[PDB]
């Protein structure tokens, strides 16, 4: 049932690399990003319909287009989805991470766009059916045990709209659009602005700069603006043993 996205999508110009970037810094390594058909896999899930046409995230499809366009230029294999329930979501995820596609891919990026709740000290995520799940559940899916195919591979999990301790993640980045705000640009949401700025920054710098630099640029950018510049800055991410640089080397292979 896995259908890689195919089709022409117009969007900003994404500068291309002219070499395989390796930081040159030398001290920290670089995730391999040089294959020509297995550069990366993107799992994009944009949920935009809930119990009633009230919380309907209008303008969300605009994000799907930006992300798809951007990752097509990064030469990723893309698996995009619309509204799905808690049960469908976890089935898709498993199907994707267990896919022959991911088995040989050099990089994995998932972007889940939905509504998020902060029940107690826990963080939850909503789906089409209105149901919720501990984001922890979602992250845990990427433990080496469950994702054999991603061990030692760059994993970027993005949620733009946010003696008995179980194992931890490695080579993983968890990105958020950290803002207790939702209305922005008179007709948008903070996550959508985060996403747009992200794609813009990716488009202009992916050819030259590693992901973590881009995320800081994204966070600085989305921050310096209106209706969300109170406690200073907005974007944020967790580095879970993501100890090497991640250059996407768009448009170039070795």
Swiss-Prot record:
Its domain of life? Eukaryota
* Modes of activity regulation: Zymogen activated by autocatalytic cleavage; association with the Dark apoptosome brings multiple molecules together to facilitate their dimerization and activation by autocatalytic cleavage.
Is the keyword ATP-binding assigned to this protein? no
Its subcellular locations are: Cytoplasm
Q: What terms describe the molecular function in GO for this protein?
A: CARD domain binding; cysteine-type endopeptidase activity; protein homodimerization activity
PTM remark: Ubiquitinated by Diap1, leading to its subsequent degradation.
The record's induction entry says: By ecdysone; exposure of salivary glands and midgut isolated from second instar larvae results in a massive increase in levels.
Q: Oligomeric state and partners?
A: Interacts (via residues 114-125) with Diap1 (via BIR 2 domain); binding blocks Dronc-mediated cell death. Can form a stable complex with Drice. Rpr, hid and grim can out-compete Dronc for binding Diap1, therefore removing Diap1-mediated ubiquitination. Interacts (via CARD domain) with Dark (via Dark CARD and WD domains); the interaction stimulates Dark oligomerization to form the apoptosome and brings pairs of Dronc molecules together on the apoptosome to facilitate their dimerization and activation by autocatalytic cleavage. Binding to Dark stimulates apoptosome assembly.
- What this protein is called in its record is Caspase Dronc
Q: Which residues of the full protein are shown?
A: 157 to 449 of 450
């Amino acid at each position: 049932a896995l259908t890689p996205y195919v089709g022409v999508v117009d969007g900003p110009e994404v500068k291309k690399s002219k070499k395989i970037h390796g930081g040159d810094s030398a001290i920290l390594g670089t995730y391999k990003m040089q294959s020509r058909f297995n550069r990366g896999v993107l799992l994009m899930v944009n949920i935009m319909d809930y119990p009633d046409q009230n919380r309907r995230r209008i303008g969300a499809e605009k994000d799907s287009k930006s992300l798809i366009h951007l990752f097509q230029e990064l030469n990723f294999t893309i698996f995009p989805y619309g509204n799905v329930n808690q049960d469908q979501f976890f089935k898709l995820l498993t199907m994707v991470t267990s896919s022959s596609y991911v088995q040989n891919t050099e990089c994995f990026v998932m972007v889940l766009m939905t509504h998020g709740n902060s029940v107690e000290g826990k963080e939850k995520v909503e789906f089409r059916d209105g149901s919720v799940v501990d984001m922890q559940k979602i992250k845990d899916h990427f433990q080496t045990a469950k994702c054999p195919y991603l061990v030692n591979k760059p994993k970027v999990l993005m949620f733009p709209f946010a003696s008995t301790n179980v194992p931890s993640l490695a080579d993983t980045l968890v990105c958020y659009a950290n803002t207790p705000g939702y209305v922005t640009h008179r007709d948008l949401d903070t996550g959508s602005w985060y996403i747009q700025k992200f794609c813009q920054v990716m488009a202009d710098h992916a050819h030259d700069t590693d992901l973590e630099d881009i995320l800081k640029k994204t966070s600085e950018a989305v921050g310096n603006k209106r209706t969300k510049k109170g406690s200073m800055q907005t974007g944020a991410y967790d580095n879970l043993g993501f100890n090497k640089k991640l250059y996407f080397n768009p448009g170039f292979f070795n």
